[PDB]
């Protein structure tokens, strides 16, 4: 059985299995953009795989078919005489397809191109598991998301990430089905304090880039505006508004030119408009008109638009949010959770959906963004875990419209965390089990990507069992860390434990499967060695019971010395802040 992230819907193996040939050929169906062709053909090139286009099943050689349902292709119509499924399947499932693998055919049908990407990166994830030289086992998957809109939000207090950085997220995204990468740096002012303005050309050509690599992953850029904080939106005439709606329209448009496809309007710390919150809707409604009109030329725009409330923290209860419910079904209202640290919750999502809902409008399923693993509130602490608090497992989905993640300023940490919205999101977790197998699990593939253990993933996820912990009020549910080592703390076994964790520590700085993560949480591993050491010693510890006390003082001292650059001042890297540092202390003295 081959490990597949996220969680297929349904995967059955009818026995059997084959070898691949050495050259292959590709089936399309009209529809299949140049992004699942590019990914298919990279897919075989890895696999040192040779493969010919042709518009034909060819016999006595390994076949590759990837097509749209009711395309009246190729691939379409060797799914119906070979493939037995109900069309109704595509129609009732979101981000439906089918992957199907038998006796020298490998093919994937979708509802959509971007469905059909997903499919072909199953395959990617099966490629890297063959046996035997290109063996494969013969199976069936019939995938399908649970929501809708998948992905995360640089929308934290903090350092923003870097142009690389972004790229290397949707490309990471980009292997577990996320859709969704909603750019909103504080530091950008062309998306607030200076919404009306246009990009200039070598800011834009960055932009550019940003919605290029969206393409190519399907980790869809979402461009985010806001146009209600500063000289905002005119509802005062006519007159005002459409020339302001006019403003909109040209922001939009020049990121449309530069591959931008998809836009998500901000409205939180901010005044409504006069008369109140019905003229977001008009709003939306009337760009909502704009972005079909804009489908003729551009094919590949969605019209699915996120809108920010200045009520995100509340219950769905508020005027605001009843009137912003009449919207389109287009429209997506985001919620934090019942306070501003909330969780992706059924009881919150159900009420929401009561709350909103008004005569002749019916209360859509809110709309997560949650503030996890955000350390904005935490900003000495990596927040390495926390899957099953803030993605609860069991929650019916059809309470959640999406879910973004507000990840940490360090771009490359948050894989782990990318990893478990990407399955979860894709494939509600039945139980915590899930949850944290899906934890356990994360490691090998923020770390190479890919389902092989490796001594660096077995170390980096050492570590990352004692760097949880958020050291917040209760503002926040507290996420628990080191949890099999907290009882043994509560001496010899324990420096077994301690030495176990510092050569782990070592290793992964030494030995990373990613370079660029390494060096992002260069702090914390530093840190790590010198927290391990202060504690070492104390555990030593007549000549030698003051000689490992003192060593140990030292040692603590120079773990607090590991600082980055934090917006406006440094912040020092902090390991094991929930057990771990207490114990230091408690055994201190
Ligand atoms: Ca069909
Ligand atoms: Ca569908
Ligand atoms: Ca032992």
Sequence with gaps: FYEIYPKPQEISYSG???????????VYDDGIDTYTKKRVDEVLEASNLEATVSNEIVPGKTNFLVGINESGGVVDNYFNK?????????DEKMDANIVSVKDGVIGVIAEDTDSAFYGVTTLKHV?????????????????????????????????????????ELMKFGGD?????????????????????????EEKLSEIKKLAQMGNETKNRYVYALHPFMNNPVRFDTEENYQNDLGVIKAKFTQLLENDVRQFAILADDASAPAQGASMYVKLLTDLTRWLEEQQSTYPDLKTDLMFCPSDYYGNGSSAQLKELNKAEDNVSIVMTGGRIWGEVDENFAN?????????????????????????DNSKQHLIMGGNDTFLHPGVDPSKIDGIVLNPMQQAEANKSALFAIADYAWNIW????????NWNDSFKYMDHGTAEETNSSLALREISKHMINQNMDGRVRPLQE???????????????????????????KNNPGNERTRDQIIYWLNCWEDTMDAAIGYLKSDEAAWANYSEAQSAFEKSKTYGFHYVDHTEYAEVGVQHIVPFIKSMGQ
């Design 351 to 375: 009420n929401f959906m009561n709350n909103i809902s008004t005569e002749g409008h019916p209360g859509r399923a809110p709309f997560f963004w949650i503030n996890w693993p955000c350390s």
């Design 482 to 508: 080191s949890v099999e080592l907290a009882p043994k703390l509560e001496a010899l076994e324990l420096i077994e434990e301690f030495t176990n964790l510092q050569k782990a520590a070592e290793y992964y």
């Design 82 to 90: 070979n493939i037995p499924h109900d069309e109704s399947f595509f």
């Design 127 to 167: 490629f890297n598991q063959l046996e035997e030289g290109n063996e494969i086992k013969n199976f069936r998957a019939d995938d399908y998301a649970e929501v809708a809109h998948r992905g995360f939000i640089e929308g934290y207090y903090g350092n923003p990430w870097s142009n690389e950085d972004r790229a």
């Design 430 to 437: 039945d139980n915590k089990e899930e949850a944290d197998e």
């Design 16 to 26: 059997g299995e084959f070898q691949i040939s050495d050259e292959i050929n590709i």
């Design 176 to 200: 577990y089905k996320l859709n969704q990468y909603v750019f909103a740096p504080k530091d950008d002012p062309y998306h607030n304090s200076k919404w009306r303005d246009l990009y200039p």
